[PDB]
Design a binder for this molecule. Structure first.
Ligand SMILES: Nc1nc2c(ncn2[C@@H]2O[C@H](COP(=O)(O)OP(=O)(O)OP(=O)(O)O)[C@@H](O)[C@H]2O)c(=O)[nH]1
Ligand SMILES: [Cl-]
Ligand SMILES: [Mn+2]
Ligand SMILES: [Mn+2]
Ligand SMILES: [Mn+2]
Ligand SMILES: [Mn+2]
Ligand SMILES: [Mn+2]
Ligand code: NA
Ligand code: NA
Ligand code: NA
Length: 326
DNA sequence: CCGACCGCGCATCAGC
DNA sequence: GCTGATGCGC
DNA sequence: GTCGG
């Protein structure tokens, strides 16, 4: 919170560039600046000071000066009063309505929550579910509920087959006291980088979590990635818990460490690490780290027996999950 | 200045 | 049906 | 929008 005013402004700018301008590198540039400012341990007193940080350049330095002086940014005040940008920014908050869809909907006169409900027939399945749970998906998840959810998932998985290992990653693994959603990494010894000896490995887990009325809806589902909705069960006479977003990802068991690194994040932390891995002659995905050739083509996967091994290849001192919240 | 910016699974669409 | 591009949410 | 080269 030391610089919460600045990082909020930059985040609002990033969202503007993503949703309205459809300018993805400006989006990430603003996100990058906001992340580096967010870990800087002094109350920023000027844009000159801010600009010393990697990722804060001249333009962001200017806007920091304006904000530090007036407590506002004219550019944002203008954006806020623009009805089209306003409507687009709102509509994108629905899961499945991206910048493209949102602009299309506004053009057709669909620009409020009321309009969206009136026109359910024009939403695809993902968007229909995002709208259905729009309000619930706004709420955060106390870690205590995350712990309850972990228990249901880990226990229900164990019931399908004792050799499933399910790990909760995401902000939960980084030690967050509240989470936007739940992210689950799934492995099973019959699914390795060398063979898939068992079919329906993910489907069986989804059906099981559905049978016990944990998973209530499905956003998308393939042979290795599920995205949907779940809900803790409520006690006798208790108000119902909010519906929550859940993702489950099945990974080859011999590639667990790149996977848990990849699904622990943060998203910015991954971008930073992967970018630095390129600079040191490697490419990292959620499956492998591979060396780059003189041309650029990736080599064969390098051996990995721990998260730290990946850090070692790229000349990075190890960082605990709790220190990867960028 | 200029070129690169992490890397991927699923849903949907256009084309053959 | 298959292949590739695009949107989307990560 | 920023930064290495
Ligand atoms: N490589 C990469 N990984 C991502 C990206 N976005 C999300 N992830 C991974 O997916 C994990 C879960 O994503 P989210 O649920 O949106 O993020 P989160 O850190 O869990 O935050 P909350 O759920 O809102 O508390 C992240 O921690 C990352 O490990 C991305 O843009 N690139
Ligand atoms: Cl851009
Ligand atoms: Mn999450
Ligand atoms: Mn998630
Ligand atoms: Mn039932
Ligand atoms: Mn609900
Ligand atoms: Mn580096
Ligand atoms: Na800088
Ligand atoms: Na959206
Ligand atoms: Na979220």
């Amino acid at each position: 919170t030391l610089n919460g005013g600045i990082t909020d402004m930059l985040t609002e700018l990033a969202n503007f560039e993503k949703n309205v301008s459809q300018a993805i590198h400006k989006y990430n540039a603003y996100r990058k600046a906001a992340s580096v400012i967010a870990k800087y341990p002094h109350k920023i007193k000027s844009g000159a000071e801010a600009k010393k940080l990697p990722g804060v350049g001249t333009k962001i330095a200017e806007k920091i000066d304006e904000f530090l002086a007036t407590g506002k940014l004219r550019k944002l005040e203008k954006i806020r009063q623009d009805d089209t940008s306003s409507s687009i920014n709102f509509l994108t908050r629905v899961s499945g309505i991206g910048p493209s869809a949102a602009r299309k909907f506004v053009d057709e006169g669909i620009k409020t929550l009321e309009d969206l409900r009136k026109n359910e027939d024009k939403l695809n399945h993902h968007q229909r579910i995002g709208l259905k749970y729009f309000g619930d998906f706004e709420k955060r998840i106390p870690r205590e509920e995350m712990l309850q959810m972990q228990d249901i998932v880990l226990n229900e998985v164990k019931k399908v087959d004792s050799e499933y290992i399910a790990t909760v990653c995401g902000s939960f693994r980084r030690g967050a006291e509240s989470s936007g959603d739940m992210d689950v990494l799934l492995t099973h010894p019959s699914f390795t980088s060398e063979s898939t000896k068992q079919p329906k490995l993910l489907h069986q887990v989804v059906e099981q979590l559905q049978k016990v009325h944990f998973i209530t809806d499905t956003l998308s589902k393939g042979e290795t990635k599920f995205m949907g909705v779940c809900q803790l069960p409520s006690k006798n006479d208790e108000k119902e818990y909010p519906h929550r977003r859940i993702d489950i990802r099945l990974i080859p068991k011999d590639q667990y460490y790149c996977g848990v690194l990849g699904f622990t994040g943060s998203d910015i932390f991954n971008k930073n690490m992967r970018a630095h891995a390129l600079e040191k002659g490697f490419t990292i995905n959620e499956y492998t780290i591979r060396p780059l050739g003189v041309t650029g083509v990736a080599g064969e996967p390098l051996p990995v027996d721990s998260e730290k091994d990946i850090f070692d290849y790229i000349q990075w001192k190890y960082r605990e999950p709790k220190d990867r919240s960028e």
